[PDB]
Design an enzyme around this catalytic site. Structure first.
Site, PDB file in Angstrom:
ATOM      1  N   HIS A 140      -4.611 -15.478   7.794  1.00 15.72           N
ATOM      2  CA  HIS A 140      -3.647 -14.421   8.107  1.00 15.72           C
ATOM      3  C   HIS A 140      -4.132 -13.252   8.958  1.00 15.72           C
ATOM      4  O   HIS A 140      -3.502 -12.193   8.980  1.00 15.72           O
ATOM      5  CB  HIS A 140      -3.012 -13.916   6.811  1.00 15.72           C
ATOM      6  CG  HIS A 140      -2.309 -14.996   6.043  1.00 15.72           C
ATOM      7  ND1 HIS A 140      -1.234 -15.688   6.557  1.00 15.72           N
ATOM      8  CD2 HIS A 140      -2.577 -15.553   4.840  1.00 15.72           C
ATOM      9  CE1 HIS A 140      -0.870 -16.630   5.703  1.00 15.72           C
ATOM     10  NE2 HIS A 140      -1.670 -16.569   4.654  1.00 15.72           N
ATOM     11  N   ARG A 156       2.514 -11.514   5.020  1.00 19.52           N
ATOM     12  CA  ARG A 156       3.943 -11.522   5.312  1.00 19.52           C
ATOM     13  C   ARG A 156       4.339 -11.105   6.726  1.00 19.52           C
ATOM     14  O   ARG A 156       5.510 -11.213   7.100  1.00 19.52           O
ATOM     15  CB  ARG A 156       4.670 -10.673   4.261  1.00 19.52           C
ATOM     16  CG  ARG A 156       4.364 -11.142   2.830  1.00 19.52           C
ATOM     17  CD  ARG A 156       5.096 -10.340   1.763  1.00 19.52           C
ATOM     18  NE  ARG A 156       6.521 -10.646   1.716  1.00 19.52           N
ATOM     19  CZ  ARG A 156       7.393 -10.007   0.943  1.00 19.52           C
ATOM     20  NH1 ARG A 156       6.982  -9.027   0.148  1.00 19.52           N
ATOM     21  NH2 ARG A 156       8.676 -10.339   0.975  1.00 19.52           N
ATOM     22  N   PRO A 206       0.825  -1.224   0.000  1.00 19.21           N
ATOM     23  CA  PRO A 206       0.000   0.000   0.000  1.00 19.21           C
ATOM     24  C   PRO A 206       0.852   1.264   0.000  1.00 19.21           C
ATOM     25  O   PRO A 206       1.806   1.386   0.770  1.00 19.21           O
ATOM     26  CB  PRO A 206      -0.869  -0.052   1.248  1.00 19.21           C
ATOM     27  CG  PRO A 206      -0.993  -1.559   1.457  1.00 19.21           C
ATOM     28  CD  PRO A 206       0.393  -2.117   1.090  1.00 19.21           C
ATOM     29  N   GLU A 207       0.510   2.198  -0.879  1.00 16.34           N
ATOM     30  CA  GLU A 207       1.224   3.466  -0.954  1.00 16.34           C
ATOM     31  C   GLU A 207       0.275   4.533  -0.421  1.00 16.34           C
ATOM     32  O   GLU A 207      -0.830   4.206   0.003  1.00 16.34           O
ATOM     33  CB  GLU A 207       1.676   3.720  -2.400  1.00 16.34           C
ATOM     34  CG  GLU A 207       2.750   2.697  -2.795  1.00 16.34           C
ATOM     35  CD  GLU A 207       3.126   2.700  -4.272  1.00 16.34           C
ATOM     36  OE1 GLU A 207       3.493   3.768  -4.808  1.00 16.34           O
ATOM     37  OE2 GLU A 207       3.072   1.613  -4.887  1.00 16.34           O
TER      38      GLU A 207
END
Ligand SMILES: [Zn+2]
Length: 267
Positions: A91, A109, A1-2
DNA sequence: CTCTTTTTTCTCG
DNA sequence: GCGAGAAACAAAGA
């Protein structure tokens, strides 16, 4: 995400959870809370969410009177608002339970982080992070930008990714910005002329503001994005440039995948 | 099986 | 301080 994706999530949360009282907080991965999970659970349980802010790619939950929960999604972080009886997904790591629903944080991750700090510690926190100005005409001063570029021998792409010249650019938008401004990613910044720096400055603001308007590039907050259909080079390897027809190439720059048009972006 | 691909911050020389 | 490389960690593809 930016920045665009984080701003989209910020807006959705602002519209949906502000005013909500936290009933309980649970974790299956307490270690992602860098300031201590049990401490956070004890401090925030029972408090009400007052607002949601953002600095660069960082989300800032304003909880209670003097609490600030700093959340970074890193590469795969995702938030979703679910029912209280929603089944656990592989997750999912943390959850804030409210009276009529829960906010769940998932991260494949496990790079994402949570940090609980005080209201007066927010500005110092970001000063320590050395985050640059927000990408707006009001905060992003072209004069300082130009001077920092003229003093440096760093390559433009890696430098922009440092978040120090301006905050918010990630691998996707940095590639899109350089293509829009017709600058090769490996160009040493001190070789950029005034007109090019000016084009770059405006392109950074325009690209990011356009991405925000379109909800970023996409039950999952910030998944209604439409900016992905506007990308000109990122992940377009082999395709033809929309301006000149040359094939977009992909190379490695400072360890990052880099997409660019060899014609529009002269090395 | 191995190797490569996809934000932040440290290690090494 | 810098550049190069990689760790934190997981999944999918050649
Ligand atoms: Zn082109």
């Amino acid at each position: 995400p930016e920045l665009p994706e984080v701003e989209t999530v910020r807006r959705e949360l602002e519209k949906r959870i502000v005013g909500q009282k936290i009933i309980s907080i649970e974790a299956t991965y307490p270690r992602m809370v860098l300031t201590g999970f049990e401490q956070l659970k004890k401090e925030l349980t029972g408090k009400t969410i007052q607002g949601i802010s953002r600095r660069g790619k960082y989300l800032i939950f304003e909880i209670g009177d003097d609490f600030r929960l700093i959340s970074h999604l890193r590469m795969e972080g995702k938030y979703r608002l679910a029912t209280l009886d929603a089944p656990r997904e592989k997750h999912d790591h943390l959850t804030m339970k409210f009276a009529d629903g829960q906010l769940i944080y998932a991260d494949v991750r496990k790079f994402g982080t949570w940090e609980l700090i005080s209201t007066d510690q927010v500005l110092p926190y970001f000063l320590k992070k050395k985050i640059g100005p927000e990408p707006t005409y009001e905060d992003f001063d072209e004069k300082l930008f130009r001077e920092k570029l003229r003093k440096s021998t760093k390559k433009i792409k890696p430098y922009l990714l440092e978040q120090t010249l301006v905050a918010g650019l990630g691998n996707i938008y940095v590639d899109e910005v350089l293509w829009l401004a017709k600058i090769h990613p490996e160009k040493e910044t001190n070789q950029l002329i005034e007109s090019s720096i000016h084009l770059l400055h405006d392109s950074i603001i325009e690209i990011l503001q356009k991405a925000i308007k379109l909800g970023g590039s996409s039950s999952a907050l910030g998944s209604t994005g439409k900016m992905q259909n506007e990308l000109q080079v990122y992940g377009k390897t082999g395709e033809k440039c929309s301006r000149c027809g040359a094939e977009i190439q992909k190379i490695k720059v400072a360890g990052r995948g880099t997409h660019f048009c060899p014609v529009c972006q002269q090395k």
